[PDB]
Design an enzyme around this catalytic site. Structure first.
Site, mmCIF file in Angstrom:
data_model
loop_
_atom_site.group_PDB
_atom_site.id
_atom_site.type_symbol
_atom_site.label_atom_id
_atom_site.label_comp_id
_atom_site.label_asym_id
_atom_site.label_seq_id
_atom_site.Cartn_x
_atom_site.Cartn_y
_atom_site.Cartn_z
ATOM 1 N N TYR A 54 -30.202 64.986 38.424
ATOM 2 C CA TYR A 54 -28.867 64.731 38.989
ATOM 3 C C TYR A 54 -27.787 64.734 37.905
ATOM 4 C CZ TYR A 54 -31.534 63.286 43.082
ATOM 5 O OH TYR A 54 -32.400 63.255 44.144
ATOM 6 N N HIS B 75 -40.735 64.430 41.289
ATOM 7 C CA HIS B 75 -39.610 64.845 42.128
ATOM 8 C C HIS B 75 -39.968 66.119 42.893
ATOM 9 C CE1 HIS B 75 -34.915 65.205 42.416
ATOM 10 N NE2 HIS B 75 -35.520 65.295 43.592
ATOM 11 N N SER C 232 -31.217 60.504 52.308
ATOM 12 C CA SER C 232 -30.147 61.416 52.767
ATOM 13 C C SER C 232 -30.564 62.335 53.924
ATOM 14 C CB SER C 232 -29.554 62.238 51.605
ATOM 15 O OG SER C 232 -30.369 63.341 51.253
#
Length: 282
Positions: free
Chosen positions: A58, A127, A206
């Protein structure tokens, strides 16, 4: 007060609602000044949220991790659970390339410790799964890092069932990060039964008739549509800890507010009725 929940069966405990930092780092152009980035994290904690999510990928060159790390400066780490991730190596026209070699795992973890300016990570996620490296190998290095005290707990993101079974055999997985909402319920078939058998925590991250159905339902439950959708996720189990992100305080408070909504089993059905990659073996 912010309820607290055991995420996984390894000892990790988090606030019932987490917070996603991804959005705070911004965007190569119009982005968020560090000032209000740190303010948003600070206020989050003031509202009782202690579980903060980020990734090495990020922002820019770990810029997101660096932000959370700066925000912790003015916070009692120790009362805070820091979730971060490694695995995405690059992103581009050919899609997303993950890396899961033990060397990469260690170097990433250390790079994250440094940017976050902490001594340990609470929850370290793969991830993205490297489909060229056996999951056992990746999970092998993560175990070492737990034992060395560099990380406390292991998480996976968007892993297949096979990947989950095999990872967990090597070392218990504490959390599985996944997409889950009223409009996206795919995980309910197999993924969720799985986390429940192996005791892995679930961390969600999200036509106008339908909007009106929802709003009419949120009005009846004294909340906003966003609040209601969130409340629906919250009610899907004690092992479910969603991590909405936001860049505005208002939205943050709206989100926290969703914790006040109590839904009976009857209410839940009415709400849901209103809305119609493996690693190689060895």
């Amino acid at each position: 007060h912010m309820p607290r929940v055991k995420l996984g069966t390894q000892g990790l405990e988090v606030s019932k609602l987490g917070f996603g930092c991804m959005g705070l780092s911004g965007d190569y152009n119009d982005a968020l000044p560090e000032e209000q980035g740190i303010a948003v994290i600070k206020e989050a904690f003031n509202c009782g949220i202690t579980f903060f999510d980020t990734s090495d990928i990020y922002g820019e060159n770990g810029s997101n991790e660096e932000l959370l790390g700066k925000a912790l400066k003015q916070l009692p780490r120790e009362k805070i659970q820091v979730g971060t991730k490694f695995g995405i190596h690059e992103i581009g026209f050919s899609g997303v390339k993950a890396k899961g070699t033990p060397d990469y795992v260690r170097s990433c973890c250390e790079a994250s410790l440094k940017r976050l300016d902490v001594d340990y990570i609470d929850l370290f996620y793969i991830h993205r799964i490297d489909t060229t490296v056996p999951i056992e190998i990746t999970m092998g290095e993560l175990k070492k890092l737990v034992e060395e005290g560099k990380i406390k707990y292991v998480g996976l993101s968007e892993a297949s069932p096979d990947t989950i079974r095999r990872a967990h055999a090597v070392h218990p997985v504490t959390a599985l990060q996944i997409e889950y909402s009223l409009w996206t319920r795919d995980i309910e078939d197999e993924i969720v039964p799985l986390c429940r058998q192996l005791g892995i925590g679930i961390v969600p991250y999200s036509n106008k008739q339908i909007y009106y159905r929802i709003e009419a339902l949120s009005q009846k439950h004294g909340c906003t549509p966003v609040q209601l959708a969130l409340a629906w996720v919250l009610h899907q189990g004690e092992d479910v800890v969603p991590i909405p992100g936001t860049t505005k305080i208002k939205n943050l408070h709206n989100n926290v507010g969703a914790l006040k909504v109590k839904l009976t089993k009857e209410d839940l059905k009415e709400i849901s009725d209103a809305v119609p990659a493996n690693t190689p073996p060895l």
